[PDB]
């Protein structure tokens, strides 16, 4: 239970490209994937400038708490793709002790400024003495698809990382009715250089 507050745990997160080879054949490329460990602490003040400010922004969200809902994920994304049409998707899975109606908000930012927001509402399914929430094959917005295409058409990986220096994603999962922050995940990116593929580090966001 890494990316977990007291009320919600994200067990799975992945962004992928699915390509149809023929009517019965599909190829899936994972860009990034997450699937009692000790998570290192990062001072949240070090990342405030990289995320939206003002009311409802990262600082406001963190100050309202709870503090145990706040995480920073560093991805090394696998951009080694290939080439029937294709599908860019995001999937994620959550578990809660509580039966809630949850809202998942994803903001894509450049220089800390919101470029696009995707919003999804999810209802609970009972499973083995708890409740599960699944966002399955959510279509990646056109901005992200364009962003990825533009990244790959850069001559060198150092250029890719230079662009990514100012690209962030903020994920906020909320109880729709109470507006309690269940999970808040800040995402930062580099390109994976390793032949071993996509990698990640997960951190707890702390005040001081």
Partner 1 sequence: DSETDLEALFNAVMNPKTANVPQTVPMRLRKLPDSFFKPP
Ligand X SMILES: *C(=O)CCCCCCCCCCCCC
3-state percent breakdown (helix, strand, coil) of the chain, nearest 5? 15, 50, 30
32 binds, among ligand X, partner 1, none (CB under 5 to 8 A by kind): ligand X
Instruction: Indicate the pairing of strand 130-139 with strand 86-96.
Output: antiparallel
Minimum Å distance from CB 9 to ligand X? Answer: 19
Told to check if 142 binds partner 1 by CB under 8 A, we report no
Sole window of 53-61, 93-101, 110-118, 132-140 interacting with partner 1 (rule: CB under 8 A): 110-118
Minimum Å distance from CB 118 to ligand X? Answer: 4
Closest CA to 183 of 76, 113, 53, 92: 92
Sole window of 54-62, 94-102, 120-128, 138-146 interacting with ligand X (rule: CB under 6 A): 138-146
Pick between residue 64 and residue 150 the one whose CB is nearest to partner 1.
150
Minimum Å distance from CB 109 to partner 1? Answer: 8
The residue within the footprint of ligand X, chosen from 11, 30, 34, 116 (CB under 6 A), is: 116
Structure-block tokens of residue 18: 């699915």
For Cα atoms 166, 168, 170, give the angle at the middle one, nearest 5 degrees.
155
Find the helix or strand (DSSP H, E) in which 74 lies. strand 70-77
The residue within the footprint of partner 1, chosen from 6, 20, 46, 80 (CB under 8 A), is: 46
Told to check if 157 binds partner 1 by CB under 8 A, we report no
Minimum Å distance from CB 141 to partner 1? Answer: 13
Closest CA to 6 of 91, 95, 73: 95
The full 3-state SS of 158-199, as one line of letters, equals HHHHHHHCCEEEEEEEEECCCCCEEEEEEEEEEECCCCCCCE
49 binds, among ligand X, partner 1, none (CB under 5 to 8 A by kind): partner 1
Told to check if 118 binds ligand X by CB under 6 A, we report yes
* Positions in 146-205 near ligand X (CB under 6 A): 148, 169, 189
């Amino acid at each position: 239970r890494s990316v977990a507050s007291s009320k919600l745990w994200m067990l799975e997160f992945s962004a992928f490209l699915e390509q149809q080879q023929d009517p019965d054949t599909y190829n899936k490329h994972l860009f990034v994937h997450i699937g009692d460990p000790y998570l290192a602490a990062v001072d949240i003040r070090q990342i405030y400038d990289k995320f939206p400010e003002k009311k409802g922004g990262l600082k406001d969200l963190f100050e309202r708490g709870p503090s145990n809902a706040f995480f920073l994920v560093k991805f090394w994304a696998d951009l080694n793709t290939n080439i029937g049409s294709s599908f860019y998707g995001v999937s994620s899975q959550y578990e809660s002790p509580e039966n809630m109606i949850i809202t998942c908000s994803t903001k894509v930012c450049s220089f800390g400024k919101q470029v696009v927001e995707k919003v999804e509402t999810e209802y609970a399914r009972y499973e083995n003495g708890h409740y599960s929430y699944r966002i399955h094959r959510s279509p990646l917005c056109e901005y992200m698809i364009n962003f990825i295409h533009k990244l790959k058409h850069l001559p060198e990986k150092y250029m890719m990382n230079s662009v990514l220096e100012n690209f962030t994603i903020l994920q906020v999962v909320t109880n729709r009715d109470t507006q309690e922050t269940l999970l808040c995940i800040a995402y930062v990116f580099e390109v994976s250089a390793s032949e071993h593929g996509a990698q990640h580090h997960i951190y707890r966001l702390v005040k001081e």
